[PDB]
Write a protein that binds this DNA or RNA. Sequence first.
RNA 1: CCAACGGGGCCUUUUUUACUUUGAAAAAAUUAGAGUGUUCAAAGCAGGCGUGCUCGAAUAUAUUAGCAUGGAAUAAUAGAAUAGGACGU
RNA 2: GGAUAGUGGCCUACCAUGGUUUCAACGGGUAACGGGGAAUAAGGGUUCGAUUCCGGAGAGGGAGCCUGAGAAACGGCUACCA
Lengths: 260, 141, 129, 144
Amino acid sequence: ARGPKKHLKRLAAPHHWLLDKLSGCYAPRPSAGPHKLRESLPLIVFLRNRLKYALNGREVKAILMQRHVKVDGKVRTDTTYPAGFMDVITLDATNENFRLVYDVKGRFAVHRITDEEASYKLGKVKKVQLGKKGVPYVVTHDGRTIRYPDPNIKVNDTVKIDLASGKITDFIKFDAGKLVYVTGGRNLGRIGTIVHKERHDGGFDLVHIKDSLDNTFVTRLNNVFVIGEQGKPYISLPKGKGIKLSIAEERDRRRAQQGL
Amino acid sequence: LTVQSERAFQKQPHIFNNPKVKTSKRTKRWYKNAGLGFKTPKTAIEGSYIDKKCPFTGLVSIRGKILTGTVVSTKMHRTIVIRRAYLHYIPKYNRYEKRHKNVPVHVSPAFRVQVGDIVTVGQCRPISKTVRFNVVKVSAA
Amino acid sequence: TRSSVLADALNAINNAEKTGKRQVLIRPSSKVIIKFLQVMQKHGYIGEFEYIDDHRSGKIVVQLNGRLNKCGVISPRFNVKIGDIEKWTANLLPARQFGYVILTTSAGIMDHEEARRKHVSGKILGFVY
Amino acid sequence: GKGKPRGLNSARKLRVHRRNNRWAENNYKKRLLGTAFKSSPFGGSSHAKGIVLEKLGIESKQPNSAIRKCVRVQLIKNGKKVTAFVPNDGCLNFVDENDEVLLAGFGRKGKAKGDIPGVRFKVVKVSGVSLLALWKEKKEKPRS
RNA sequence: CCAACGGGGCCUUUUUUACUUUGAAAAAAUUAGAGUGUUCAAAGCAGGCGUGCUCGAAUAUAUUAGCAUGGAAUAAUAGAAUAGGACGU
RNA sequence: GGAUAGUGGCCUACCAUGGUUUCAACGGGUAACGGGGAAUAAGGGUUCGAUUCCGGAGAGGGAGCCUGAGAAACGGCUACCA
């Protein structure tokens, strides 16, 4: 190729979007933005495929151009704007708010939240450094840069951000006994508490997690997101609380209980 | 050996020793520790050689693979060849065969190296058409 | 040029069993031979056996009771993964429900059924049935 | 025993030994040398087309006694010259010189078939119509 | 209660590799496979229930090389002999 | 030292005499684009993959270059050969 690529063939799209095979040759390519392509969710996929409010790509554009949709409190009109993990979406007519968060199957859920909780989002600290004229700043996972952090904030901490003003209001240190959310790899979508961390200089650190049924598993530190203290989340959790079940357990619950 | 053997004066860059002060001490020398647990040898701290490719006194840095092998040739200036040996599995016959590779690596004047020594080497940026590794520890077999 | 002391020992036992003898003598012994015989003894294929000291690798005399059909060694000692054990038993044993394949593992020398309970693997030595 | 190495690190000699011995297999050697491109009249295809030069009768091998009907053909894509058998008796009246014919192999992968010495091919179509249809009187052949 | 099979602790004088277990990794489609009367089937990923409500889009496999981890049988390698050795408090 | 967005015999000056190989170098052939995969299978194997996805190369044959964040572009330009 002689330059950047503008198209995305279907089958090459991320699998967690749940696009069907046969409806067309192409898929929506996400624009450049706050979140990586492979792990974003384009707005067209949210409005058409999940909520069913639109039947066509044409109808989706008719909604956005009326300015009915805002992301993190700002109006967006790009059909392929890349929303992502922990973002807040607001539809003012219908009077609904959503936070993008994972299912234990590893898909973005439709999770409704109250008008109060829509005020803020969490962010993982990716780096901390001195800027020009010696002013320190932090960078979050969604690419915000925030001036003058508290001197105690360090990498892998989590930070609470007011969507109006954009200032930091609270933070939680990475430590044993914290709640974590898993955001990548095979265990995507599980929730548990930190047991301990393995240091591997020049390599990848590993973290041991235990969930409330006291199953244990291991992930690379890159995939770990701190979300609160033991038993006190800073956000509302999705239905099912991140507890993974075996295929035998799932079969029983459906047909025995819900299947009546 | 004679340090000033070349047509150009050899020095460490941006290390300035000021004649205005004239302290009765060693010429100033800069050095670092490479990390990952490799100890900087005393011959580097107290020596007098100039070598911009040395891992403890030059502008190189070590990151990536770390490998071992046996010394097979020492005939080039400041470089050696090591031999690495391994077994390759062939599924149809359910058996192994022997194979080897040759790796050319740079060696600092801090180390004394002889044919048949076992050596540990660390990866650095490309420093020649073929050399990619730097000697970082020696064991005298 | 004895390349395998274990191979000689089981060959002597086979030839004695076929002709109907009640005892056999084997030379030399080794730790591996003793371990192998103890497994055979546990499952009832041989009687008691006795070791003779001579300052020179010793000798063994084995009592035979007529139950043994065959024993043998597999050479080379191929590496075996846990998923592979099921293939060796299909090839070597005469039925699904008797006979044993014998392995060296870092947990010790044992038959293939004990290795499944303990969930270990290693290298194949031989077989008995 | 058994005259071949068993050792756990002997894999190199085992595979080299097999490579040397496959050259005695008859059809293996034909593939690897590319014999079908360098020689044989169909350059590896299942059929070929040619022009009829002249009409021949071939005496069958003893003990059978018959004069069998054949033609000389020059292949269009090579210029190579070949003899072909014409099945089904009186069908020889349907072929004449400078007709164009489609040829097929005589079923034995390059060997001669039955009584007929040195004939490796049979006629399938003449002037674009199949001999089977002519023999059963299902179509008609235009002259030229 | 009791029998078998697995496992931990304590007492009894108490260098470097191969190999094997477990884990993270190995795109989707294809392959094996769970659910669902496309009128059946090849398919598809849908669809049920009152006439607004609601379950889904699983799971497995994937040689070899690289990474992390438990074991110490088997097979190699090293060490105190012109002591130049260990502890030296 | 020069040049490059930048490392490097990438190129120049001076200097040394090195580097690969029976564990198959170097040379020759392929009716050879690589892979995910396909056919036939008791098990172990054999044969195929121009072709719906990923990566590479080319626009009659070779060379050169303008504009531009990005091209040695051919539904851009310049010369030679056919």
